Structure formats: C-alpha cells, structure tokens
C-alpha cells in the first residue's frame, strides 16, 4: 500500500486504541461500584460472551437477550429495556415484580464467570445484581484486550510506515538524479 | 515491481504464492484471491465448476473483510450468522492445502493427487454446510473430502 493509505489506517487505529482505553477505566470504575453493592446482597454489549452464555442454558430483563432469540423463538416468553447504565436499585427492581403477578397471566472473579410477593422480589434482585458485576468485569477485560490488540497493530503499522517512508524518500530522489544526469 | 508486473499479460494462468499463507502452514501457499486464469469460464469448465469456484472466493472475501472487527472487538461482537461464514472459510482455507509427492522427503506425509470431479464435490459440500459439525484441523493436509471425514474420526479418539 502507498504511504498515505498507511497514514490514514494508522491514525484510525490510534483513535480506537485511545477510545478503548477510556472504556476500560469507565468499566473499571463501575466495576468497583458494582462489587460494593453486591457484598450485602443487559442491553449494552461489548462484554465478552455473557449474553450468549445466558442463551446456552435456556435452550438446553436484558433487551440484548431478546435480539438473539427473536428470529428463533419469539412466542414463548412474555419486555424490558434500558439496562446497564446504572446498577438496579430496589425502587427500579420492583417494576419487574409488578409485571408478573399483577398482569394478564453469576460473578466469581475479574476474568471468569458462570451462568410470595416479597420472596419473589428478593430472588430477582439477587440475579440482576450478580449480572451487573459480571458484565462490568467482562467489559473491563474486553475493552482492555481491544486496546492491547490495537496497540500491537499500531506497532507493526508504525514499522511498515517507516519502511515505506524511507522508500518514498529514496525513490523520489533517484528520479531527480536520473533527470539531472540526462541533461 | 516492473519485472513480475509485466509478465502477467504474457500468461494464461497465474499462480500467486503468498508468504502470509505459507507462514500459516497452508501449503501450497496459493492465494485464492489473487491467482487467476483465462479458461475459468462457464462455457469451458462448465456451469457447476464456475459456480463452485466463485463460492469459495466469495466466502473467503467475506472472511477477510471482517478481520479488522475480529482484531479489536472479537468473535463475540460478530453477528450469529457471520460466525457461520467465518467458520466455513477457515475450513475451506485448510482444505485448499494438500500433501505433495515431492514434499514427502521432508514433510513425512504421503503425497495426494485429487481428481477434478472429487475436488468440486468436496468444496461444494463445505459451502452447503454438510461438514459444519466437524473440526477445522480435519481439513488440514488431506486429499479428497472423504479422507477429511476419516481424519476427524481419528481425532475423535483423543478420548
């Protein structure tokens, strides 16, 4: 590729590398907040294979879960959205309970994870809190890998950039020397 | 470069050997989106040959188009249907490899000589999705498609 194509490509990944670095620390900040609230007791992606791991056990809350199963099995389960921005408080968690009875009808560590009114309000609050801390830990490492993978591509493109940089300087100069000799 | 660039016009069939393909272990390292031929035409080779020929190159191009997405984000960020297209392309890449007769001396594996009709049949089954359950390493360095299925059963015996 020409020198300009390497420059545009190098500038592209440098931005993505810096942007993925920002999402790592934002995920790490919300991870700290999530773990404190979990000790007593989603929609947004970019968090490893959590949403697929939930679908693994169901075949054998969270609008992203609907997107996977909508084409295959839509009529089975009865809808929630906007989950991931803030951890689910007891006030917001009670809305899940209202759309069940009054109606017509897990985090381990930073780099690994595994998938009547008042009693039911406790079990739903436990599952969502564990899911909140799981996705923040996964998004932390996911964006951390994205930045580190971007860093490697920048390093190799920087070497390819400098090789092509020198070649252009040498080639253009040989044209001028070729021109002067022919006079 | 001027020297190789000029020769292209003087050739009927071209065979572009890539280093990136060779370094991955895929031999012979013939680039499937660079090598070309003038007899590659439905009138000459037949409509079934030409249709299967473009199908291999199509899914290989789609697989190559998603490399930037797999590098930064990952395989999990890809769509469910896109995972199927990436899976088959890698099996197609490995099935394009082949043990050579002259390579026996250093490689060790016996050389293969696949007929034309068996080649077209083999790749067409992979594109249709008749061997999606089998692993990739079964396709690496085999003759026809029949020996790829038998090689998967051998790997199945690691317990």
């Amino acid at each position: 590729a020409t020198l300009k194509d390497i420059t545009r490509r190098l500038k592209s990944i440098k931005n993505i590398q810096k942007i993925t670095k920002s999402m790592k620390m934002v995920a790490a900040a919300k991870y700290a907040r999530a773990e404190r609230e979990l000790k007593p007791a989603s929609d947004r992606g970019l968090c490893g294979a959590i949403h697929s791991s939930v679908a693994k056990q169901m075949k054998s809350v969270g609008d992203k879960i609907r997107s996977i199963l909508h084409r295959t099995h839509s009529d089975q389960f009865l809808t929630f959205k906007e989950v991931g921005r803030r951890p689910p408080t007891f006030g917001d968690a009670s809305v899940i309970a209202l759309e069940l009875l009054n109606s017509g009808y897990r985090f381990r560590s930073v780099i690994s994870y595994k998938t009547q009114e008042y009693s039911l309000a406790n079990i739903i609050y436990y599952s969502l809190k564990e899911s909140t801390t799981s996705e923040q830990s996964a998004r932390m490492t996911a964006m951390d890998n994205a930045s580190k993978n971007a860093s490697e591509m920048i390093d190799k493109l920087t070497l390819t950039f400098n090789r092509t940089r020198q070649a252009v300087i040498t080639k253009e100069l040989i044209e001028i020397i070729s021109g002067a000799a022919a006079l | 470069d001027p020297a190789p660039a000029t020769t292209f016009a003087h050739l009927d069939a071209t065979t572009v050997l890539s280093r990136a393909i060779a370094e991955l272990g895929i031999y012979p390292a013939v680039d499937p989106l660079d090598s070309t031929s003038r007899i590659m035409d439905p009138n000459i080779v037949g409509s079934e040959h030409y249709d299967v020929a473009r199908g291999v190159q199509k899914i290989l191009q789609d697989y190559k188009s998603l490399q930037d997405i797999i590098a930064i984000l990952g395989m999990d960020e890809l769509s469910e249907e896109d995972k199927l297209t990436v899976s088959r392309a890698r099996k197609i890449q490995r099935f394009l490899s082949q043990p050579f007769q002259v390579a026996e001396v250093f490689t060790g594996h016996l050389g293969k000589l696949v007929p034309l009709k068996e080649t077209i049949k083999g790749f067409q089954q992979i594109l249709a999705g008749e061997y999606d359950h089998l692993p990739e390493q079964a396709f690496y360095m085999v003759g026809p498609i029949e020996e790829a299925v038998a090689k998967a059963d051998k790997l199945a015996e690691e317990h």
Binding site: - | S87, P135, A156
Partner: peptide
C-alpha cells in the same frame, strides 16, 4: 495484528474441542 490471530485461533480451538466432544459421544 498478531493478537487477532491469537483470539480467533483460541475461539476456534475451544469450539473444535466442543465439536470433538459431540463427535466422540455420538460415536459411542
């Protein structure tokens, strides 16, 4: 990127192990 190939090969090595597990249990 080298880590592109690292993540991809890791993913398909895991899925290759799953496919060999299903293949062996079906073989029995």
């Amino acid at each position: 990127g080298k880590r592109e190939q690292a993540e991809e090969e890791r993913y398909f090595r895991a899925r290759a192990a799953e496919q060999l597990a299903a293949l062996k249990k079906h073989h029995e």
